[PDB]
């Protein structure tokens, strides 16, 4: 297979304005949302049809309870952080946990915490330690690292349990997560715009080459964007030189297939 990733996000906001929730939790396999929970619904609900189809009510009832607890725990350590920083008003607190299953068979695990959208605490499962970006984080770190049973737990979960979940979901959503839709590539003029659309997965490689050598460097890349139908689109541009004749060609790579469009 390709590189597949499972990643779960949690957001905590201190003074949510108006109808904004104070706690949100969403799960992703690759680029697809699979499960969601907010402080208003207080339920864990499917966000993909193949998730609702394959997981018994037991699952949703069990994880609903757990997320209610996490809503509490996050509201409490957002308070302790905000006191240590001496920060008034609004601040955010985020958490990302997850796996990656690489094509070659290797894996990666990661668990991170964030404050105001900045790195705050990063876990290293290979050294069983927490990296702190400041001294507020350093204070939290010293307590966490004193409980090595907890650290050993996280290492085991990231390396075995998360990966196991991912394989489980990859099969649930096989018809979606493991399909290939090749890109449609064309070349426009204004600078040559190499434009691709209608492809999945969204991982795509585009570049311009002059006379057989890569432009190193002033290619202008466009972001990979969702089309709204499950496919994606992107582009790359280079300005054409009016002094010299040059063979410009756009190179696209996608799911193991290389493509060349010459001009």
């Amino acid at each position: 297979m390709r590189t597949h990733s499972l990643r779960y996000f949690r957001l905590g906001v201190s003074d949510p304005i108006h109808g904004v929730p104070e706690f949100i939790s969403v799960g992703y396999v690759d680029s697809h949302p699979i499960t969601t929970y907010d402080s208003v619904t207080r339920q864990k609900e499917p966000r993909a049809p193949w998730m609702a189809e394959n997981l018994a009510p037991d699952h949703w009832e069990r994880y609903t309870q757990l997320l209610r607890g996490w809503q509490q725990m996050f509201k409490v350590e957002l308070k302790r952080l905000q006191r240590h920083y001496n920060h008034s008003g609004s601040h955010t607190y985020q958490r990302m946990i997850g796996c990656e299953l690489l094509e070659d068979g290797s894996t990666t695990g990661f668990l991170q915490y964030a404050y105001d959208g900045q790195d705050f605490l990063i876990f290293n499962k290979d050294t069983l330690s927490w990296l702190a970006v400041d001294n507020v984080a350093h204070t939290i770190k010293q307590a966490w690292e004193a409980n090595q049973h907890e650290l050993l737990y996280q290492k085991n979960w990231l390396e075995e349990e998360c990966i196991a979940w991912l394989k489980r979901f990859l099969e649930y959503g096989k018809d979606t997560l493991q399909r290939t839709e090749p890109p449609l590539v064309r070349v426009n003029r204004k600078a040559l715009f190499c434009k691709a659309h209608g492809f999945y997965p969204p991982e795509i490689y585009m570049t311009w080459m002059k006379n057989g050598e890569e432009i190193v460097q002033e290619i202008d890349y466009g972001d990979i964007l969702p089309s709204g139908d499950g496919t994606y689109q992107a582009w790359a541009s280079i300005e054409l030189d009016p002094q010299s004749s040059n063979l410009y060609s756009c190179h696209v790579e996608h799911s193991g297939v290389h493509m060349v469009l010459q001009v």
Partner: antibody
Amino acid sequence: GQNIDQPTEMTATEGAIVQINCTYQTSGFNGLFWYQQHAGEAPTFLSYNVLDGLEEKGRFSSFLSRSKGYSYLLLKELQMKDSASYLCAVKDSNYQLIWGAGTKLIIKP
Amino acid sequence: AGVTQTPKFQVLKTGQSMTLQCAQDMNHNSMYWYRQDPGMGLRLIYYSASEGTTDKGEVPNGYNVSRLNKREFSLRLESAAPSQTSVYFCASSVWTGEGSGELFFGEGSRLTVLE
């Protein structure tokens, strides 16, 4: 699964060494706990294993093999006060505890 | 201190109402009610992940619970039955979900139900 197996009763001599086995067949693995329960009393935490290897705490040690799906609690230099029931408990994929039926340790003086 | 549970003993007729009390002063979020029976491992009746929610365990039938606050988690026998004869243990932990956190048990309560 899900299933945890533990011998019903074990007998060993004072001063000797005893090894209480715990084999588990669960849906995922998030850690294995050992508990000590004296007759008439409440269970109290003994040890916790989640990664392969042997962890020592005094006269007691706990070993874990994730691949083989088993753990043992080792008690060295047995004393009469070690006479109790020992409970094995595994946390599954959904962080729920499965409890073994416990093992009653009888110590011959 | 620790985990406090009452009563330690109780005799009940069929089928009588009964409420078991449990309190913890360790500022724990998750609390539990277990029943212990000869020949089998502990069985969860009900649990409470945190101060504002509870849920069924493995053997919820014939029971109900109330997480009154962060400290108190009460078990309730609706109508006593001979099969409910058991030792009941209250327990609490820092967090029921992710973690290496262990359980802290209460002294236990022996209920005997007779005709």
